[model samples]
Target: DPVPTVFFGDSYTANFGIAPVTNQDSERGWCFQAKENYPAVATRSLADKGITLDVQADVSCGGALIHHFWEKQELPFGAGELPPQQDALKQDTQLTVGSLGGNTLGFNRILKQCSDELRKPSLLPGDPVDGDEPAAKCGEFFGTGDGKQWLDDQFERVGAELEELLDRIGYFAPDAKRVLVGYPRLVPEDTTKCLTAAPGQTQLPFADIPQDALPVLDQIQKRLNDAMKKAAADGGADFVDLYAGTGANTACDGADRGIGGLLEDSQLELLGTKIPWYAHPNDKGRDIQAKQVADKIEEILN
Candidate 1:
């Protein structure tokens, strides 16, 4: 039987940057959606198992916040705008899956701040890799003072927004089995490999994401996952822990990495055109995600 489905969320859900972004007006590729994204992969996987999505709309876009679900989202780089993500919903919709909340938590701002503060290693063997520039204090910013309160307050605020969205989703599609997907591990627990200061080497981790900042980023990601889970539970939806299945396949783990790092993984080569890495997952990573989603969906449907 054909089930109506919709996949909603932001850049990660859209799974751009791994393949050549599709459905863009120009080469700027703001949405960054590829046919190989997890939703697409999951759809394919389900089809193989005799669960066909009779109707589907993947409204995932790059750089989307939770508010984008209900409000108009203007894309960057003059790439145009998108209708609210919720527009895809209908009374007959059966399944809804999404990944959201990072933008609402100022994740992009944190990334930019951390990256801008990074001091690339000096080529001279004797000189300290950081030189005189103090280490990136992103952790201190979040872990101390008002920033700590701000992080707490933000999660609370965003979590409420999540509940509201989930409620709306319930209202819109009363029978839909909603699944909120979480992000996979982007950084490893061991920062030693990430701290490699070899600018002369062939591959480079994101100089913007220094070793000191990874833990703070991880903390925020975990907080988001927790918030997502609570909201899903409260709103009567299921949450898929993509992070649980994706081990240390972080961006810094070389070939073992599921999430692509900063120009370090060869998976960045999409359609024979090399693009700078933007911390999206590679094909293997997305495939892994697809299997996880398919399993959850099958379980729920049964």
Candidate 2:
């Protein structure tokens, strides 16, 4: 018999924009899932080796925060709503795989937001213009005042929620081989290689995200991955890290990009078509993720 598995997480696990959503009815009418996502690929890879694993549930969604694990998630831009992700697990579940924690930290949402604050000088015609391309100073932005408080507070919230989630997973599927996956590196360590476009604004001016913002974005992912590793250790689950080898294939890496950019990429395509999936993985990236996940599952199941 095939091992009953449940895959759950946010956009990284969902691999949005590469393929059509598979569980639209189950996860509401949103959660754009790719057929080539890590779990599905892992399943097929295992089957080729004579090990069968059935994908019983795939409850991953875009823009999902940790609270959405147990609470209903609302997707913006008319993507419909999703039920609680954690509800998919049961005693029959034998394997649990997914990537999480990025959305809990607000991930890329904070990037554009910090960019907005940087472009504040262009507001209101007579507003004080600091005649220069404002460098992204996110450390100063989030290191002081209300922003600092919010950053610290959210970290604590994510930590607490992850513990609760692990506890619930253990309770529901006591025998399942739980593998919590970490996110891949999205921004290159070198800020010079990243792209930042903010064409969606005018007077209420959505401003261009600056190159300096890439370092801040990179650090945020590092912290988020660190938190997930800690949670996996404390919660009695195995953590599969994708961050270690993904630095060379970040969003702005041009043809070798694993992560998608703000709009789209030139060389990265899905099934011979150019895709517009912003800030997610390209097919190559997801394939790398799939191979890693398959190896991990093989180790656990064998």
Candidate 3:
């Protein structure tokens, strides 16, 4: 066996709605999607004509917080609960690619806030606010309020936790090379234009997401990535800038890079398109990200 043992994080890594390969929903998620590597892409690419690479990847669902990392990933066995992914990592584990952090914060709150705003028509722009962008000018399209600082703190906390997790990983998978996967692009780096097609009226049902807290939200993501990068570097693992590569066409208005957003609209629309949800990537979006990540890791792996 050339190498074995792999790990992915969060919902995206879990492949959520990506379906199953053999009718078993359990094996779905990013690990399945990224299966294009194994005996498929990488095996063919690395092997001249008959070469092969066999690796087992551990992907856990709803594994979205530092607590998840603690109870599920970093620590296992009688922790009252064992993360599927954690159990998947055995003494023979060799390579690791864990993409976590988003769920640690931001996501859950964002989803709820967007949904609530979608229902309340009375909460329109100018409803009344006193910081940053005026609600009047911004159309009440604000992301979770007071949640920004909380998310920032979580990122810092996650970074510190990730550092600890990486250390533990080093101890366990002594021979495995690690890669700290950053969160893919979610919010637009430049959000003013992205908010144009925002829900004109509350719960107007939009297919596009408004750049409400975009700039700030994206910055928070950046901060998270920055922390990951430093920790990855320090821990001797490769860090993938999944954020920057996909940020360009994420949700900038008139950018044509990805779909637009209103946050009010359901993701069912983009279910099959490039812009899946305001945050989670659709099939196309995942493909783009996975390719970028795989390509970046190719040189190192080879």
Candidate 4:
């Protein structure tokens, strides 16, 4: 019989908030692709690729933090129920993979807030009420000052939670080959020509991301990925460095570049309301991620 593989974690693993964001359950995330393409048999068979696993237990929610893996997340709009993501594990589980730790630091939320504040009069180029960095208008408000104390605190928290998560994975599936997936790059280290802004705008009009904030944002993401790698190593799990695999193709990479820009559309028009898909992977990006992971899983199995 093929080995039973299971997946659990946050949106990155669940492919949440990608384009065509119509139904939460239907998104084909990397895990989903891996399960389908790998092809596991119903009965045990060493010859088969591996038993195809159920995708329904993805359990990963769009905004899940580490705690959500063990907490009941009540979805609004009659979307349905979500039990603890950890519950997806079983005794026969032979593989586990997913991404987490972003929401815990409020990374996306902070970016949104910064983008919003970037346009304020005090934050503009000529406005100097906040000080030399214009941080009073954005990053500094969250303690970006003094070596990014706020970001540091969050990184520590994420590391602690990741350790706990790894411990839990050990408990749930003692023998599973645990693979902690890392997040892809969303912003560029150097923003020179990758992104642009209209006159009088402090940031991108649609995405609401500040033009000058790319470098700092990139730093924050790199730190988070670094923490994830360390936690994975400490836990004796393999880490997939999606960021390295997706070098130079950040959201800033315009369509003309035609590179592997993993980020989704800045905003989506749904029911007349513009919803932000910022930082989420689009179809092509997800495909690359799926292949990367699938290759890893195959290598381990072999």
**Using lDDT as the measure, which candidate wins?**
1
Candidate 1: clashing pairs of residues: 115-208
Over the stretch 1-302, how does candidate 1's per-residue lDDT look in tens digits?
A: 89899999987788866565666446336677775788888888899899888647888887788888999888754657788888899999999998888778756555554554222321101221223333365566667744577678778879878988898888888989999988887766776766663334365565655566787777777788788888888889998897766666776666667766554433335456566545677777788788888889998998
Q: Model 3, 1-302: lDDT tens per residue?
A: 36574755665554433433222333233122333322133334544533333557545443355456556433212223345455556567777776766666445444444343432342111112223333323223333445545555666777777777687778777887887777666666555545454334232113323434455556656777788788888888888787777766564433334332444332332246432233444454556555665565565766
Clashing pairs in 4: 1-43, 1-44, 1-45, 2-45, 40-50, 40-51, 40-52
Candidate 1 is scored at a TM of: 0.86
Model-by-model lDDT, in order?
0.72, 0.70, 0.51, 0.58
Highest-scoring model, TM-score: 1
Which residue runs does candidate 3 get wrong by more than 4 Å? Answer: 20-51, 72-84, 114-149, 196-210, 252-278
Q: What's the number of clashes in each of the models?
A: 1, 0, 12, 7
Cα deviation at 95, candidate 4, in Å, is: 0.4
TM-score, prediction 3: 0.68
Q: Candidate 4 versus the native: TM-score?
A: 0.74
User: TM-scores of the models, in the given order?
Assistant: 0.86, 0.82, 0.68, 0.74
Cα RMSD of all models vs. native, in order, equals: 6.0, 6.8, 7.4, 7.2
Candidate 4, 13-74: lDDT as tens digits: 65543444324254322112223211121111323445344432445556677777777654
lDDT value for model 3: 0.51
lDDT of 2: 0.70
